[PDB]
Design a protein around this nucleic acid. Sequence first.
DNA 1: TATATTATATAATTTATTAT
DNA 2: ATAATAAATTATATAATATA
DNA 3: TATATTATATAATTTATTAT
DNA 4: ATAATAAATTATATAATATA
DNA 5: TATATTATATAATTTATTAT
DNA 6: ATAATAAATTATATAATATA
DNA 7: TATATTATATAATTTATTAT
DNA 8: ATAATAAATTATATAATATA
Lengths: 183, 183, 185, 185
Amino acid sequence: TKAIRLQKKINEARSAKKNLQQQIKDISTQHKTLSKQRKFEEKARSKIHKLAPGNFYSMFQKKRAGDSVAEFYQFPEEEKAKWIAARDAYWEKAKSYFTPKPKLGANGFAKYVQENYIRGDSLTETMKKLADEWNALSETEKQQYQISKEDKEKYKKALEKWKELRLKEYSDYLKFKENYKVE
Amino acid sequence: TKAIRLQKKINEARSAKKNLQQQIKDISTQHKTLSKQRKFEEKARSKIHKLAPGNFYSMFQKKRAGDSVAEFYQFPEEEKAKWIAARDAYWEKAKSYFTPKPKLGANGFAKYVQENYIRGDSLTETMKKLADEWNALSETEKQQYQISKEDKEKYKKALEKWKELRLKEYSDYLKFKENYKVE
Amino acid sequence: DTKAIRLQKKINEARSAKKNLQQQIKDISTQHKTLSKQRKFEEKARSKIHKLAPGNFYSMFQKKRAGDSVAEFYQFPEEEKAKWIAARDAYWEKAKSYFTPKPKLGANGFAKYVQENYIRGDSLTETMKKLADEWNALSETEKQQYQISKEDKEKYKKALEKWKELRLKEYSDYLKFKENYKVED
Amino acid sequence: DTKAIRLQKKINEARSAKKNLQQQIKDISTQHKTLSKQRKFEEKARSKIHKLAPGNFYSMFQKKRAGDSVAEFYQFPEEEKAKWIAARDAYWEKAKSYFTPKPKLGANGFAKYVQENYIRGDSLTETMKKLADEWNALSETEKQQYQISKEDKEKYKKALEKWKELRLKEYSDYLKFKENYKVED
DNA sequence: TATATTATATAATTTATTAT
DNA sequence: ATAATAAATTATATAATATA
DNA sequence: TATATTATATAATTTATTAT
DNA sequence: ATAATAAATTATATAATATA
DNA sequence: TATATTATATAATTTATTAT
DNA sequence: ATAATAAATTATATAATATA
DNA sequence: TATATTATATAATTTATTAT
DNA sequence: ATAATAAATTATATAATATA
């Protein structure tokens, strides 16, 4: 019974080590899923940039993309212009899917420049002169040029809803890009 | 909440690994205890051998045992004989603590030699002649020279009780040997 | 004999070879941390120089937490605030003297078209759009004229190399300045 | 450059050195199993030769389980049993011919006293006890006469060495005999 | 550094050996 | 089997290396 | 997928037992 | 040493688990 | 061999750059 | 800010090595 | 007991925002 | 580019856990 108890403890240890191995594999699988999710959310909110024409052409050739752009460099002017116009129509359709990111309000000296910039001024000269005016302000004079807590929370709410909808917009864009014929 | 769940799984994994480390240390400690127990039970049932005189002398000198036996080799005859007589009295007292192991009954050809050996015979000649007689027996003639199942189970019961009491006897002997003054 | 003799020799070689492996693992770990420190320093020595905020200036001279330090700087009077701002500005002049601004690469393609063909315009967005229309109406060899030659590219390569070098020494001198700078203002 | 160059060289040395360590671990494992097989064979080549049981003899010639084989051998008739016993005995004579019995070391101390001073006795236990009384009544130099000289010890050392050698060849020949032995009886 | 190896230093026990 | 001894073998203890 | 464990299934060896 | 065995112990092989 | 590294091969995206 | 491009940087995919 | 992690606390840098 | 900031992001340091 001494060795019986000891073997019983050995068997519980081997079972416990098996449960640990399963939990490690479960956290690894879930971690890979969350890493893919984070990558997707990063691309779905990124800055939308007009696709270059070579990348368009490699999108439409099932050969490898690099060689396709290389062959696109040697193209004549006429086929190159046809590809560029088709790429531009695709660009209009593509940018349609996305909503531009909510901008935050001008604050402090930025708001001062927003209010006291007058049309037809040297930007460097106006910025420096406005800076000299701004620096001479007392701290409560500056404190009235800040964004209220109400507008800050409104921008928080708008950025939050946009962080949501850019996910769905990006998915719709990806479906558009996979199923887009030149036509 | 994705990362919340994932971290929760990571924390359960670190707790589970801690429980596993504790269980491994528990089985290691218990394993060492059982190994000491088995060693003790092995010595408590071993064959009792009369202690050599040098080992006696090293028992009684708190210097290291090997050097003590080495100094005991160079001893004169008189002190050597005093140590040997004291060791012999210790041997009588020591062998008193132990019960000799139950012998199993003679079986088969051994029992045949037990029954047909007659006093004053060449042992090699009697053993060989009895072997020639034995081999010529039929299988049921041999089968009556075996130990009955009843006596086999009786020897099992006796060896079992002895395996028990040799533990207690050995412990009493160890207490005797630690607390024994020559006197 | 020789079976056990060979076996013992290999067992000794493994224990020595295992110590050698353990040493290389910590040495490559050491060099990896060192080369990373080397990277983050050469990165800081080349970044864009930004005028230190006054709260950060005030926290530089107090051996306390930076958050607590800037919080104490916000509640300053207007005069004390102006004195710290003037001291921070004298510091910033002395600091920006140490650095060389990064060499820019030449304008290429449409950027060079704007650089060569920009005429003063009251509306910049219409001006850039008009230059875009002129550029797009150009042929491919007309556009190809507006690219940077290999000579200008290699000159910028050597300029960026010498600058990446010298910014390390500039940053080292700046750090010596920042450690040994008494407020004095 | 050279920071990363040195670091990459050490990282490559560790991965090669790690393969070298993995190889030595399995090689020392291989040699350890091999040297253990070497030990168990030289051990079997020198053990005391015991006449093979008839059930084990019968199981040698059947490609079945040994327990089942001896069970089939127990239920044999007396005549068939005698035939197998005679065949096993012819086998045992042919087998024990292959081996040399182990050289014994000379009797020493009280054993040599018994070897030199044993006179025929009807009661052996009283005889050994009487020799014990004669021995114990001897002085220490009288006892010291009855020990084995260094010359006889070294002769036994060389004899045991040559025997430990030759028993390997004897056991090898016996195994060739046992593999190539047809029952024939 | 606790806590397995390992190893190496020392003591305890068994074995061999005589005869039978 | 009785019986006695060194030698060999095994076991045990303590120190060193190595691995959690 | 080799390759330590490990475990356990089967066989091989050794032991004990008579007498002494 | 003589000799024949059941039984106990050890060794080897085969199958399963597991950890490189 | 599943299943982390890693690495190396290829594609996607951002940056710099002109003027302001 | 507008706008256009190669180049650089980053990210992604696939293949190889290594570690459970 | 160094020494990877790791985690999290604090500080440093960069970004965005106005105009353009 | 000019310039001043809150805020966001990244980097560095300090403290805790953990695995050599």
